[PDB]
Amino acid sequence: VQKNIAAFGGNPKSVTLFGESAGAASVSLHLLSPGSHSLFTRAILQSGSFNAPWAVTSLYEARNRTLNLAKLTGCSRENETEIIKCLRNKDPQEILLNEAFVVPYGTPLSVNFGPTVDGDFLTDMPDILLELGQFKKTQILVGVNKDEGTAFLVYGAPGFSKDNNSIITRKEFQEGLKIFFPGVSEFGKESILFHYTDWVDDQRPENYREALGDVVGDYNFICPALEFTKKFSEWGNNAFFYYFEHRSSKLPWPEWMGVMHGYEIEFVFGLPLERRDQYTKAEEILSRSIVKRWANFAKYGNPQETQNQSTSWPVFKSTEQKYLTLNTESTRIMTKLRAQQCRFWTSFFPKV
Amino acid sequence: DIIIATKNGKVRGMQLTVFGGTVTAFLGIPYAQPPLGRLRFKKPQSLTKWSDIWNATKYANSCCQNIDQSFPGFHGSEMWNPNTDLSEDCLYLNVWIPAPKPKNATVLIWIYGGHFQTGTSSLHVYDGKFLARVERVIVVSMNYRVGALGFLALPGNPEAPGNMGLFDQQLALQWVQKNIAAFGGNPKSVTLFGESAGAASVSLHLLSPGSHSLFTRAILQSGSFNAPWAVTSLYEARNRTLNLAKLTGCSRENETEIIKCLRNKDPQEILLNEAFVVPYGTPLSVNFGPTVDGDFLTDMPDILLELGQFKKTQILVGVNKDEGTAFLVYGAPGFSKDNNSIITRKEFQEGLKIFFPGVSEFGKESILFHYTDWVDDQRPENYREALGDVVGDYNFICPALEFTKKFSEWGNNAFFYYFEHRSSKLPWPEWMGVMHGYEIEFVFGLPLERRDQYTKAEEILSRSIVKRWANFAKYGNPQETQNQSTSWPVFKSTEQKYLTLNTESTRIMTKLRAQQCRFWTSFFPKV
Amino acid sequence: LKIFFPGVSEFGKESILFHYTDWVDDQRPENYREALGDVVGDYNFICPALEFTKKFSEWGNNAFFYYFEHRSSKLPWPEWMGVMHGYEIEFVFGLPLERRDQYTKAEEILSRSIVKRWANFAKYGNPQETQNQSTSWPVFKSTEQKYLTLNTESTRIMTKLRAQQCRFWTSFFPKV
Numbered sequence A: 001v002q003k004n005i006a007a008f009g010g011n012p013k014s015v016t017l018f019g020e021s022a023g024a025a026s027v028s029l030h031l032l033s034p035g036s037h038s039l040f041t042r043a044i045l046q047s048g049s050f051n052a053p054w055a056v057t058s059l060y061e062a063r064n065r066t067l068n069l070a071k072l073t074g075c076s077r078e079n080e081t082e083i084i085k086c087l088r089n090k091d092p093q094e095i096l097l098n099e100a101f102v103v104p105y106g107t108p109l110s111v112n113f114g115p116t117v118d119g120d121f122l123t124d125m126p127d128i129l130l131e132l133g134q135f136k137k138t139q140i141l142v143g144v145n146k147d148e149g150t151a152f153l154v155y156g157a158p159g160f161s162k163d164n165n166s167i168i169t170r171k172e173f174q175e176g177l178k179i180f181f182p183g184v185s186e187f188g189k190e191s192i193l194f195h196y197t198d199w200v201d202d203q204r205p206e207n208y209r210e211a212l213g214d215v216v217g218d219y220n221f222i223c224p225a226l227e228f229t230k231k232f233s234e235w236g237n238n239a240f241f242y243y244f245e246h247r248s249s250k251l252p253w254p255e256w257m258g259v260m261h262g263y264e265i266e267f268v269f270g271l272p273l274e275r276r277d278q279y280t281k282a283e284e285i286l287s288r289s290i291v292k293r294w295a296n297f298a299k300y301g302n303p304q305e306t307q308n309q310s311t312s313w314p315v316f317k318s319t320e321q322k323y324l325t326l327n328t329e330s331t332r333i334m335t336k337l338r339a340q341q342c343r344f345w346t347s348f349f350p351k352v
Numbered sequence B: 001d002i003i004i005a006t007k008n009g010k011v012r013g014m015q016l017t018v019f020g021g022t023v024t025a026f027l028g029i030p031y032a033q034p035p036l037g038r039l040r041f042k043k044p045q046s047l048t049k050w051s052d053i054w055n056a057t058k059y060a061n062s063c064c065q066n067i068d069q070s071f072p073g074f075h076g077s078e079m080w081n082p083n084t085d086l087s088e089d090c091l092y093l094n095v096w097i098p099a100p101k102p103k104n105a106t107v108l109i110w111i112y113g114g115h116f117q118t119g120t121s122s123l124h125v126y127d128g129k130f131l132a133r134v135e136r137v138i139v140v141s142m143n144y145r146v147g148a149l150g151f152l153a154l155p156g157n158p159e160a161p162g163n164m165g166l167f168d169q170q171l172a173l174q175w176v177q178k179n180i181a182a183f184g185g186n187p188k189s190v191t192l193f194g195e196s197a198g199a200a201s202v203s204l205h206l207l208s209p210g211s212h213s214l215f216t217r218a219i220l221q222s223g224s225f226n227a228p229w230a231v232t233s234l235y236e237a238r239n240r241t242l243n244l245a246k247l248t249g250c251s252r253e254n255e256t257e258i259i260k261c262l263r264n265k266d267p268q269e270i271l272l273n274e275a276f277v278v279p280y281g282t283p284l285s286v287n288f289g290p291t292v293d294g295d296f297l298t299d300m301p302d303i304l305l306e307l308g309q310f311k312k313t314q315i316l317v318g319v320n321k322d323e324g325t326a327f328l329v330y331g332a333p334g335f336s337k338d339n340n341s342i343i344t345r346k347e348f349q350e351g352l353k354i355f356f357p358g359v360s361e362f363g364k365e366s367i368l369f370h371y372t373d374w375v376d377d378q379r380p381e382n383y384r385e386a387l388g389d390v391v392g393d394y395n396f397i398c399p400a401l402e403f404t405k406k407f408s409e410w411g412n413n414a415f416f417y418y419f420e421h422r423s424s425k426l427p428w429p430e431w432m433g434v435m436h437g438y439e440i441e442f443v444f445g446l447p448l449e450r451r452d453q454y455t456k457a458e459e460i461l462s463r464s465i466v467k468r469w470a471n472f473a474k475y476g477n478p479q480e481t482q483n484q485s486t487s488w489p490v491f492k493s494t495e496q497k498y499l500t501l502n503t504e505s506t507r508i509m510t511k512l513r514a515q516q517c518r519f520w521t522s523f524f525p526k527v
Numbered sequence C: 001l002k003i004f005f006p007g008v009s010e011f012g013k014e015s016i017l018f019h020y021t022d023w024v025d026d027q028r029p030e031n032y033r034e035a036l037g038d039v040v041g042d043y044n045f046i047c048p049a050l051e052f053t054k055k056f057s058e059w060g061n062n063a064f065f066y067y068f069e070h071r072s073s074k075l076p077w078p079e080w081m082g083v084m085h086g087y088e089i090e091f092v093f094g095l096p097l098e099r100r101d102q103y104t105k106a107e108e109i110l111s112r113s114i115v116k117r118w119a120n121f122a123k124y125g126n127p128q129e130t131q132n133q134s135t136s137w138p139v140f141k142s143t144e145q146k147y148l149t150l151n152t153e154s155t156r157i158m159t160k161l162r163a164q165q166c167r168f169w170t171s172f173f174p175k176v
C-alpha cells in the first residue's frame, strides 16, 4: 500500500487499519510494532485487542506446541533447524490435522498458534510496551458488542444449543466454567461463580444462561478492550469507544444469543445500504451512520456524523470513561462500561 | 564460530552458557591506540585498522594503578583489585550480546568507580552476561586511564590537558555509536551506568557537549560530579602536577618539558609518587581527577548544573543506606573490620580530623554539633554510627540528592532509590551495614545464579532490580509492571519521593536525610 | 481461619487464604504464623480504623492517623507477638515517665512525646510536638492518606497504610 496505492489514486499518508477479533488484536500489535509505525496513520479495533487472554502465545507455550506438533507428525528431532526441514515435507493436510491436539485441552477460544514475542515484530511482552507507553501515538476507535460471549457457548458448553432457549442450571453453569477455564484452580472458578451469580433476583430461569455468556464475553473481549483503550489514552491521544447493541433483523442464530460477536461487521461494511437485501429501514439508517463515522475517523481522526443532528461522540479519557452506544433506537453517551465486572477480570483474575 | 565485522576489522568472540541459554561475549576489543611513549598523557588517538581476526576471548590489561594493600587475603577488599595484568596498554572494551543475536537491542554501558585512581571493567561483579541473558540487553564496559596517567593536568597543553580518562570513556562511546549495530545493538538506545567515580563520570557526560550525541539516558549509583571528591580544582591540579614533577626529579621551567621528562619515567615511578602529591590524604582522596579543562568540561560544573546546561533526558539516581562505613576502616581511630568498633567522643573527634584535614576547628565542631545530638540513651554505638553517617552524607548521599533535585528542576523525569539491603554473603562485619559498592552485584544479577549461595529473597530482589534498570534503559521508566510491584514515582523538587529497595517491604518515602543534607548543602560549603 | 471465621463459607476462607499466603518467598518458616496475625489484626482493627478515618475526614474535618510500632522493653508476652494490641496504652498514660520503673531511656522519650502530642490534640486540636524539632504530623486526607509512625528509632511520614490488604477486607470481604 505505501508503495503502490498512489497509482490507484490513494493517499499512502492517510491509511487506517481496521479489523475484528484476531484482526483487531493484529491492529493493536501493529500499534506496538516499530516496523509498522510508518505504514499507517490511525487504527480501528472491533471486538479485539492484543491484551485479550487468547491473543498472545507465551514463549513457554509456543515451544511446547512446536515440539508437540513435531512429535505428532513423526518429526521429533534434536537439531531444531531439522525439525523444521521435516515439517516442510509434511503436506499441509498433515500439519492441519495435528494442530488441534498440540494443547491437551482446547476451549472455543483456543488460539493454538498465535503472535509471540519473537524479538522482531514484537521486541518485548506487549503488556509491558502498553503499560510504559511504547507504541505509535495516534487516534484509535475501539468497540465491542453487547453479547460478545454467546456465540462461543454453542461449541461445547453443556445444555446450550442454537436450536432451543438454552435455559441452564447452576450445575450446568459450573461445568460450563470448567469448559472455558480448563486449568484454572477450583478457587479461580468459584470466584468467577461468585462474582457473576449474585442475583437481583428472582429467580429468573435465564440467570445462568445469561451469566455464562457474560463471563465469556467480559473476560475475552470487553474488559481487555476497555483496558487497552484506557492504557492507550493515558499517553495523550484521542480515543473513542463504542458499545454495539443492535441485533441484525436477519441474524440466523437464535434470540437468546443476542447481539453476537461478529455481527457489527456487516454494518461497518454497509451491507444494509443494499435495499434489495431484506434489512429494515432503521438498519439502513444505522449502517449509513456507522459508515460515515468510520470514514470520518479514517480521513479526519474524528468519528462524528456532523450533518444529521446526531449525538456527538466524546473522546474516551481515563477519568470519565465516556463511550457511545450504537443502536437503531436511542443513541446515547454512557460512562464506565461494565465497571464492576472488569474490576474482577482486570485486577483480581490475573493473580489466580 | 562467531565473527563480527567492525569498522576497524574482524573480531572473534566466545559462547557462554548462562541459565540454560547462551550469551556471546567479546572480551578485550581494542578501542584506541595504546597510549604509550609520546602518547602518554594525551587524549586517546583513534585506532589504525586491521586485516585478520582479532581474538576477543579474554579480558585485556587493566590500566596502571596502585593496589589496596590494607587487607591482604581478605575477599572484602581484594574483590575490588585488578584481576588482569596492569599495563599502559589498557584501552579495551567488552561486549556481551544475547543469543540468538538481537535485532535492535538497547545498550547498557558500564563505567567503573575507584576514586578515578583505580578500577577495571573485568571484575566479577561487573560481568554483563546475566543482563544479556535475562533482559536481552547488550552490555558494554571499557577500561579507561586512572590516576595521573588518566588525569594529570596542565590546562590548554595537549601534551597533558587533563580529563584523558574521561576522553577514553568518550571514545569507547563513539566505538558503540559506530559499531554496535553490527552486533545487533541500537546505537539510538544507549544508557550509561556507573558507580562512585563511574557515576560521577556519567554525570560529567551529562554535562559534556561532546558526549550529548553518544547516549540516550543515564543511571548514577552512589556518585555525582558535585560530590566533594569528584572534581580537582585548577589550583589543586597545578600544585599536584608540579609536586609530582618535583618528586620524580622532573622539576623544569618550560612546561612541555616537565611532560617530556615524565614520559621517560616508567609507570612504577609515577605510581609510587602519586600518593604524596597532596600533603594529607583521606580514604576519599582523589589526587588526580576531572578538571575544568576547557574541552571536555568548559566551565565549573556546579555552574553548568545550576543554570541548566546539560543533556535533557531521564536519570535514575541512588544511594546505599550505609555509604560511609567502608571508609572508616582505612584510617579512622578505633575502627576495625575485626570488632564492633564501638568508639568514644574523643575517637569521633580524631575521626573528623582524619576525614576533614583542614577544615577549621569551627568547621569540625559544627559537624560534631549537627551529628552528636543524641535521642538518647546513651547507646554505645552512637558515635560509631554518627561518623559513618557524617562520611556517607557528606561524600555521597547529600550530593546525589542535590544533583537529582537540580537536574529535575529543568523539566526531565528523574527517579531516586535508597538501597537498603545487606548481602547475606557480605564478608565485612555487621556494623558496616549496607555498604558502599554492595548494590552492584544486585544490579548485575549475580544473585540470579542459584549455584551461588545467595538467599531466595535475594534472587527476587535482584530479579526485580534488573528488570527495573532494563526498563529504564529501553523505556526511560524503571517500573516492574508484571508482578504487582510498588510503582516508582518520579522525583520532583517539591515532594522529593524516592523508592526503597529491600527484601522486606518496598516503600515510597519522601525527603531522604532532609535535616542532614540542609547542613552539608547549605551551611557546610561556607566554612 | 476456621477458628476466627466460624461461618464463613469455604470460599470466604479460601479467599482470605489466597490474599494472605502469596509468599515473597522463601520459604520463611514464620510465613503462616505472621500471616494469621495479619489476617486477624487487619480484619478486626486496622482496616476498619483506616476506613472510619477516611469516611470521617471526607466531611471536612481534620483527622490525624498513627501507626504505633514500638514493642515495650518490658512486654511479658513473647517476641513473635510483636507490637501487641493494648500495649500503646501505657505509653499514652506516661508510665515510662516513671524512672523507678525499668523502661529504657528511649522509651521515656517516646512516651514524653506521645503524651505531649495527645495533650496538644485535646487542648488545641493539633497533635504536634512543637518544641523539640519533631516530625510534623500531617492531617489525614482521603487522597494522600498520610499517617505518622510512632517508634523510638525514626519517626516517619508514610502513606496508604496496608493499601493492598484493606482493599480485600473493605471492598471484597463484606459480600461473602
Ligand SMILES: *[C@@H]1O[C@H](CO[C@@H]2O[C@@H](C)[C@@H](O)[C@@H](O)[C@@H]2O)[C@@H](O[C@@H]2O[C@H](CO)[C@@H](O)[C@H](O)[C@H]2NC(C)=O)[C@H](O)[C@H]1NC(C)=O
Residues within 6 Å of the ligand: A064, A068, A069, A071, A072, A101, A102, A103, A104, A105
Ligand atoms: C506440554 O505438552 C505435554 C505433551 O502433551 C501430550 O502430547 C502431545 C503431543 C499432544 O497429543 C497432547 O494432547 C498430549 O497431552 C503435556 O503433557 C501431557 O499433559 C496431560 C494433561 O496434563 C497429561 O495427562 C499427559 O499424560 C501428558 N503427556 C505427556 C507425554 O507428558 C503438557 O501438559 C503440556 N503443557 C502445558 C499444557 O502447559
Ligand SMILES: *[C@@H]1O[C@H](CO[C@@H]2O[C@@H](C)[C@@H](O)[C@@H](O)[C@@H]2O)[C@@H](O[C@@H]2O[C@H](CO)[C@@H](O)[C@H](O)[C@H]2NC(C)=O)[C@H](O)[C@H]1NC(C)=O
Residues within 6 Å of the ligand: B239, B243, B244, B246, B247, B276, B277, B278, B279, B280
Ligand atoms: C602545594 O604543595 C606544597 C608542597 O608540598 C610538599 O612537597 C610535595 C612535593 C609533597 O611531597 C608534599 O607532601 C609536601 O607537603 C604544599 O606545601 C607544604 O605544605 C605542608 C603542610 O601545610 C607544609 O608543612 C610543608 O612544609 C610544605 N612544603 C613546601 C615545600 O612548601 C602545600 O600545602 C600544597 N597546597 C595545598 C594542600 O593546597
Ligand SMILES: *[C@@H]1O[C@H](CO[C@H]2O[C@@H](C)[C@@H](O)[C@@H](O)[C@@H]2O)[C@@H](O[C@@H]2O[C@H](CO)[C@@H](O)[C@H](O)[C@H]2NC(C)=O)[C@H](O)[C@H]1NC(C)=O
Residues within 6 Å of the ligand: A011, A013, A014, A015, A041, A298, A299, A300
Ligand atoms: C495527499 O495529501 C497528502 C497528506 O494528507 C494527509 O495529511 C496527513 C498528515 C494525514 O493527516 C492524512 O489523513 C491527510 O489526508 C499530501 O502530502 C503532502 O505533499 C507531499 C507528498 O509527500 C509532501 O512533500 C508534503 O509536505 C505533504 N503535506 C502534508 C501536510 O503532509 C499529498 O501531496 C497529497 N497527494 C496528492 C494530492 O496527490
Ligand SMILES: *[C@@H]1O[C@H](CO[C@H]2O[C@@H](C)[C@@H](O)[C@@H](O)[C@@H]2O)[C@@H](O[C@@H]2O[C@H](CO)[C@@H](O)[C@H](O)[C@H]2NC(C)=O)[C@H](O)[C@H]1NC(C)=O
Residues within 6 Å of the ligand: A157, A158, A159, A160, A161, A163, A164, A165, A166, A167
Ligand atoms: C437444548 O438442547 C440441548 C443440546 O443438545 C441437543 O440438541 C437438541 C436440539 C436435541 O435434539 C438433543 O437431541 C441434542 O443432544 C440439550 O442438551 C442435552 O440435554 C439432553 C437431555 O436429554 C442430555 O441428554 C445431553 O447430555 C445434552 N447434550 C449435549 C450434547 O449437551 C438441552 O437439554 C436442551 N434444552 C432445552 C430444551 O431447554
Ligand SMILES: *[C@@H]1O[C@H](CO[C@H]2O[C@@H](C)[C@@H](O)[C@@H](O)[C@@H]2O)[C@@H](O[C@@H]2O[C@H](CO)[C@@H](O)[C@H](O)[C@H]2NC(C)=O)[C@H](O)[C@H]1NC(C)=O
Residues within 6 Å of the ligand: B103, B104, B186, B188, B189, B190, B216, B473, B474, B475
Ligand atoms: C532501532 O530503533 C531505532 C530507534 O529506537 C529508539 O528510539 C529512540 C528515539 C530511543 O527512544 C530508543 O530508546 C528507542 O528504542 C530506529 O531508528 C529509526 O530508523 C532510522 C535509523 O537511523 C531513522 O532514520 C528513523 O527516523 C528512526 N526512528 C526513530 C523513532 O528514531 C532504527 O531503525 C532501529 N534499527 C533497526 C530495527 O535495525
Ligand SMILES: *[C@@H]1O[C@H](CO[C@H]2O[C@@H](C)[C@@H](O)[C@@H](O)[C@@H]2O)[C@@H](O[C@@H]2O[C@H](CO)[C@@H](O)[C@H](O)[C@H]2NC(C)=O)[C@H](O)[C@H]1NC(C)=O
Residues within 6 Å of the ligand: B332, B333, B334, B335, B336, B338, B339, B340, B341, B342
Ligand atoms: C577494635 O580493634 C581496633 C583496631 O586495631 C586493632 O585490630 C584489632 C583486631 C587488634 O588485633 C589490635 O591489635 C589492632 O591494633 C582497636 O583499636 C586500637 O586500640 C588499641 C587498644 O590497645 C590501641 O592501642 C590502638 O591505638 C588502636 N589501634 C589503631 C591502629 O587504631 C580497638 O580498640 C578495638 N575495639 C574494640 C574491641 O571494641
Ligand SMILES: *[C@@H]1O[C@H](CO)[C@@H](O)[C@H](O)[C@H]1NC(C)=O
Residues within 6 Å of the ligand: A079, A080, A081, A082
Ligand atoms: C544443525 O544442523 C544444520 C544442518 O543442516 C546446520 O545448518 C546447523 O548449523 C546445525 N547446528 C547445530 C548446532 O547442530
Ligand SMILES: *[C@@H]1O[C@H](CO)[C@@H](O)[C@H](O)[C@H]1NC(C)=O
Residues within 6 Å of the ligand: A288, A289, A292, A305, A307, A308
Ligand atoms: C443524512 O440524511 C440525509 C437526508 O436529509 C440523507 O440523504 C443522508 O444519507 C444522511 N447521511 C448520513 C451520513 O447519515
Ligand SMILES: *[C@@H]1O[C@H](CO)[C@@H](O)[C@H](O)[C@H]1NC(C)=O
Residues within 6 Å of the ligand: B055
Ligand atoms: C585465535 O584463536 C583461534 C581459536 O581459538 C585460533 O584458531 C587463532 O589462530 C587465534 N589467533 C591468534 C592467536 O592470533
Ligand SMILES: *[C@@H]1O[C@H](CO)[C@@H](O)[C@H](O)[C@H]1NC(C)=O
Residues within 6 Å of the ligand: B254, B255, B256, B257
Ligand atoms: C618550550 O619548549 C619546547 C621545546 O621542545 C617548544 O616546543 C616550546 O615552543 C617552548 N616554548 C616556550 C614558551 O618556552
Ligand SMILES: *[C@@H]1O[C@H](CO)[C@@H](O)[C@H](O)[C@H]1NC(C)=O
Residues within 6 Å of the ligand: B463, B464, B467, B480, B482, B483
Ligand atoms: C515475576 O514473577 C514470575 C512468576 O509469576 C517469575 O517467573 C518472574 O521471574 C518475575 N519477574 C520479575 C521481573 O520479577
Ligand SMILES: *[C@@H]1O[C@H](CO)[C@@H](O)[C@H](O)[C@H]1NC(C)=O
Residues within 6 Å of the ligand: C112, C113, C116, C129, C131, C132
Ligand atoms: C523536650 O526536650 C527538653 C530538653 O531540651 C526536655 O526537658 C523536655 O521534656 C522535652 N519535651 C517534650 C515534650 O518532649
Ligand SMILES: [Br-]
Residues within 6 Å of the ligand: A057, A058, A059, A060, A117, A125
Ligand atoms: Br512471553
Ligand SMILES: [Br-]
Residues within 6 Å of the ligand: B232, B233, B234, B235, B292, B300
Ligand atoms: Br576550577
Ligand SMILES: [Ca+2]
Residues within 6 Å of the ligand: A186, A187, A190, C010, C011, C014
Ligand atoms: Ca472454593
Ligand SMILES: [Cl-]
Residues within 6 Å of the ligand: A146
Ligand atoms: Cl447490557
